[PDB]
Amino acid sequence: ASVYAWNRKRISNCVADYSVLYNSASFSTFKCYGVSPTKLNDLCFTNVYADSFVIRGDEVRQIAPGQTGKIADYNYKLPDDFTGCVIAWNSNNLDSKVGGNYNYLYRLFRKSNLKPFERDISTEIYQAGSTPCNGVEGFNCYFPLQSYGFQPTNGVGYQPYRVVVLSFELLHAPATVCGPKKSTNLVKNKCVNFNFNGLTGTGVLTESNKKFLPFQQFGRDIADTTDAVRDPQTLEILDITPCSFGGV
C-alpha cells in the first residue's frame, strides 16, 4: 500500500525468526534501533507492529527515529524511542514498471505533521491560502497526495523501495514474540547439565518405562524432586537420576 496508508500488521503468538532476514543478504537497508539484531533474536517481546509500504530511496532516511521530512512528517512518523528495526530493499523489478508505476502515492501536502505511529488517509484538498477549495483543485488548493513515479531506469534515490518497520513491544501484557529457542542434540546415560523448557536440572537422562499423560510434561517424586521429563521435541519420557556421588 501507499506510505500514507502504510500496512500495519500485528505479529504476536508466533516465533519470529530474525536470522533468516539477517542473513538473507539481499536488502539495501537494515537498521536496528535500540537493540542489535543478534541479541533481539534471543529475546521475547509482547508484540510487533510491522508497517510495510513503498517509498523512494531518498525517503528511506526519512523512515527512521528522530527524522523529519515529507514522508517522516506527513506519511509515517517514528517515535525517538524506537525499539524494532527497519528493513528496506529495492523493488525496481517489482514496484517499477515501464511508463511509471503511478499507483503508489505519498502525502506530499498536509496541514500538520503526523503524530508518531499515526496514519493519515484524508483525501480532502489541502487549502494553501484563504481561498476555499469548494471540493475541487485550483488556486491555493492542491491534492494532499502525489503519485509515486517508479520506472526500471530510476536511480538509487528514485527507484521504488519497499520498507518494513518492525517495532517491538514488551509491557505488562504477556510476552508473545520470541525468536527460535535454539535446541541442541540429546544425550543419554551421561551426567549432563540439562534444561528442558526451564527445568534447568542436572543429572543422567535414561530411557524411561513409565507412561505420562499427553497433557503432562514432567514427573515428580514423593519428595517433590523432578525424576522424569518428557522431551519437548519427539514425545518420549526420560528418567533423570542424580549425578553419581558419594564419600571417599
Partner: protein
C-alpha cells in the same frame, strides 16, 4: 501565508508534476522515433502540446510569486528560468507569426531540392544526396553547381523569412529587456547573484574574441597547409595566396573540413588509426560496443549503469517492420529515464558515437537528484563535451589495445600522430573560426547594427578575413547562405559548438592531469583512471545549480575560457604545420576570388 514557504511548496509540487509530464513527452518522442507511425506522431504532438501548456501555466503561476524577497539561490535560479517566457512575451498574433515563419523556414530547409539542368525531373535533397556528393565528388564544376543551387533555391526563399524572423526575435528581445536575440541567447551563460562567479553576456563575447585571437596563428598555418594540398589537388582552381573556395571545404557551409582529409592527408601511404578490421574479426556488434563502453565506464570509477536502459533502449536497426531514426540521440526523458537511439553498426565511428551517447546519458544520471528545472547542464556546451572527451579517450590506441581492438604489436610513430592530429583539426579546429564568425554574424544581425542592404557584403568579408575562405560565386542580398545552415534555419545557437570544443579540450587536459598522463595529449587515455573519473563526476553531479564558471574552476582551475589545453593537444601538429608551411604563403588574401582572374 508568506511568499517564501508557499512558493517553496509550490516549487516542489510543480517540479514533481513537470518532471512527470516531461518524462511523458520525451517518452512519446522516443516512441515516435523508434517506430514512425501515425499514432506515434499523434502521441508526440499531444504530449508536446500538453507539456508546453502546463509549462506555461506553471511559469505564469511562478511569475505571480515574486523573486524580490526569495533568497534561495537554487529556488531563485529555477524561478528565473521559468520566468524566461521568450517568444510569449509578445502578443498572440506576433507569437503565431514567429511560429509560422520558423516552421516555414525549417520546412524549406529540410525539403529543399536541387535539380540538374540536364534532367529537371531528377532532383536531390540536401541529405543524404548533397552531403554525400560534397564529401565524395572532388569535381570543381559539380561541387560549384551544387553549392550555387543549394544556396539559391533555399537562400532566396529563406531571405525574407530569415529577415522577418530576425525582426521578430529583436522585438521579443527588446520586450524581454534585451538588446537583441543574441543577448537573450547569451543570457544563458550569464550568472547573477553568485559571489566570485558572476558572468556577463559581453564577457563571453570578449573571451571568445580573445581565444580566437590567440588561436589565430595555428588556424592560419592549418589553413595554409590545407590550401597547399588543395593546389596539390587543384593546381588551376585556387591561388597560393588567395582564400579557399567555399565549396572546396568538404561540406556545404564549410562546417567540417574532415572530407578534405583525403586530399590534405600529410602522408597518403601511412596507415590511419583504425581497428575496424580487428573489430569485425573479433565478432563484435552493438551489444559488444555497449558492454565495452560500460566496462570503460566502470574502469574510470563511474558506477555501473542501470539495467532499465538495457531492457528498454534499442541498439541496432529494428529490422524493416518499423522505421527508427538513425541519428544518434541521447534521450534524458525524465523521472530517471535515460535512453539511447541510434543505428549502431560494427564500425569504429559508430563505436565512438555510441561512447559519446552513453557519455551524454551518464551525465544525465549525474544530475538526476537535482530538481527538474536544475536537471540540465549549466550551459549548452557541457553534455556534448562530456561525451566527446570520453569518445576521444576511447579512440586512443591505448584503449583499443586494452580492449583488444588494437594489437600490442602496433607501432606508434610520429606519422600516425600527425595524421590523427590533422584529421582532428579538420574535424575540430577547422570549425572553430567558422563557428565563431557565424555566431558573431548572427549576433550583429539580431543587433541590427549592420545595414541589411550589404549584409552579404559583410558576410563574405568575414569569410575572407576570419575563415580565409572566399566564395566561388558572388552572392547579393537575395542569397541567404547563412540561413541555409540547419542551425540558422531551425533557431539553434551556434556558439554551443565552439564553447563545447573548448570545454572538452579543458576537460581532456584535466582528466589527463588527474590520470598522471605523460606524453602527447592525443595519445592520453583516461581508461583505468579513477581520479579522472572522480574529477569529471565532481562537475557531472553538480548539474546547472552551480555557475558554469564554478564548474570550469572545479574541473581545470580556470574560471573563464582557456585555450592552453588546445595548445597542449595540438603542439605536435602546430610544429609540423610550421615546418611544412615554411615554403608556402602563410595566411590569406581577401582580394583574390575564384570568379576574378
Amino acid at each position: 501565508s508568506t511568499i517564501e514557504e508557499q512558493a517553496k511548496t509550490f516549487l516542489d509540487k510543480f517540479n514533481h508534476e513537470a518532471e512527470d509530464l516531461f518524462y511523458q513527452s520525451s517518452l512519446a518522442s522516443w516512441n515516435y522515433n523508434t517506430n514512425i507511425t501515425e499514432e506515434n506522431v499523434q502521441n508526440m504532438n499531444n504530449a508536446g502540446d500538453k507539456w508546453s501548456a502546463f509549462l506555461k501555466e506553471q511559469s505564469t503561476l511562478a511569475q505571480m510569486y515574486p523573486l524580490q524577497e526569495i533568497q534561495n539561490l537554487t529556488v531563485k535560479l529555477q524561478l528565473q528560468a521559468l520566468q524566461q517566457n521568450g517568444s510569449s512575451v509578445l502578443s498572440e498574433d506576433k507569437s503565431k507569426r514567429l511560429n509560422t515563419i520558423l516552421n516555414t523556414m525549417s520546412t524549406i530547409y529540410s525539403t529543399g531540392k536541387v535539380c540538374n539542368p540536364d534532367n529537371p525531373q531528377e532532383c536531390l535533397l540536401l541529405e543524404p544526396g548533397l552531403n554525400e556528393i560534397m564529401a565524395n565528388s572532388l569535381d570543381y564544376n559539380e561541387r560549384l553547381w551544387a553549392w550555387e543551387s543549394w544556396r539559391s533555391e533555399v537562400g532566396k526563399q529563406l531571405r525574407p523569412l530569415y529577415e522577418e524572423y530576425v525582426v521578430l526575435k529583436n522585438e521579443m528581445a527588446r520586450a524581454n529587456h534585451y538588446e537583441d536575440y543574441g543577448d537573450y541567447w547569451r543570457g544563458d551563460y550569464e550568472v547573477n547573484g553568485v559571489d566570485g562567479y558572476d558572468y556577463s553576456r559581453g564577457q563571453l563575447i570578449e573571451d571568445v574574441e580573445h581565444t580566437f585571437e590567440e588561436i589565430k596563428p595555428l588556424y592560419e598555418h592549418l589553413h595554409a597547409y590545407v590550401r597547399a594540398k588543395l593546389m596539390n589537388a587543384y593546381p588551376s582552381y585556387i591561388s597560393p595566396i588567395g582564400c579557399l573556395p567555399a565549396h572546396l571545404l568538404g561540406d556545404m557551409w564549410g562546417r567540417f573540413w574532415t572530407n578534405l582529409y583525403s586530399l590534405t592527408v600529410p602522408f597518403g601511404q601511412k596507415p590511419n588509426i583504425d581497428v575496424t578490421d580487428a573489430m569485425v574479426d573479433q565478432a563484435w556488434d552493438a551489444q559488444r560496443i555497449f558492454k565495452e563502453a560500460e566496462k570503460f565506464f566502470v574502469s574510470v570509477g563511474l558506477p555501473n549503469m542501470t539495467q532499465g536502459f538495457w531492457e528498454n533502449s534499442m541498439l541496432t536497426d529494428p529490422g524493416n517492420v518499423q522505421k527508427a531514426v538513425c541519428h544518434p540521440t541521447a534521450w534524458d526523458l525524465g523521472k530517471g529515464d535515460f535512453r539511447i537511439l541510434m543505428c549502431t553498426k560494427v564500425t569504429m565511428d559508430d563505436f565512438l558515437t555510441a561512447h559519446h551517447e552513453m557519455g551524454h546519458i551518464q551525465y544525465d544520471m549525474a544530475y538526476a537528484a537535482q530538481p527538474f528545472l536544475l536537471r540540465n547542464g549549466a550551459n549548452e556546451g557541457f553534455h556534448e563535451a562530456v561525451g566527446e572527451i570520453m569518445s576521444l579517450s576511447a579512440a586512443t590506441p591505448k584503449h583499443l589495445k586494452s580492449i583488444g581492438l588494437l594489437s600490442p604489436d602496433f607501432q606508434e610513430d610520429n606519422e600516425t600522430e600527425i595524421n590523427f592530429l590533422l584529421k582532428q583539426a579538420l574535424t575540430i579546429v577547422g570549425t572553430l573560426p567558422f563557428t565563431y564568425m557565424l555566431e558573431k554574424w548572427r549576433w550583429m544581425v539580431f543587433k541590427g547594427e549592420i545595414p541589411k542592404d550589404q549584409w552579404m557584403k559583410k558576410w563574405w568579408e568575414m569569410k575572407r578575413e576570419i575563415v580565409g575562405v572566399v566564395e566561388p560565386v558572388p552572392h547579393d542580398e537575395t542569397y541567404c547562405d547563412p540561413a541555409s545552415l540547419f542551425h540558422v534555419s531551425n533557431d539553434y545557437s551556434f556558439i554551443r559548438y565552439y564553447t563545447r570544443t573548448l570545454y572538452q579540450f579543458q576537460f581532456q587536459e584535466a582528466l589527463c592531469q588527474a590520470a598522471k598522463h605523460e606524453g602527447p595529449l592525443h595519445k592520453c587515455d583516461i581508461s583505468n583512471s579513477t581520479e579522472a573519473g572522480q574529477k569529471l563526476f565532481n562537475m557531472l553531479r553538480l548539474g546547472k545549480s552551480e555557475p558554469w564558471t564554478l564548474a570550469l574552476e572545479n574541473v581545470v582551475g580556470a574560471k573563464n575560457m582557456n585555450v592552453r589545453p588546445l595548445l597542449n593537444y595540438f603542439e605536435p601538429l602546430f610544429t609540423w604545420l610550421k615546418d611544412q608551411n615554411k615554403n608556402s604563403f602563410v595566411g590569406w588574401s581577401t582580394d583574390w576570388s575564384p570568379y576574378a582572374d
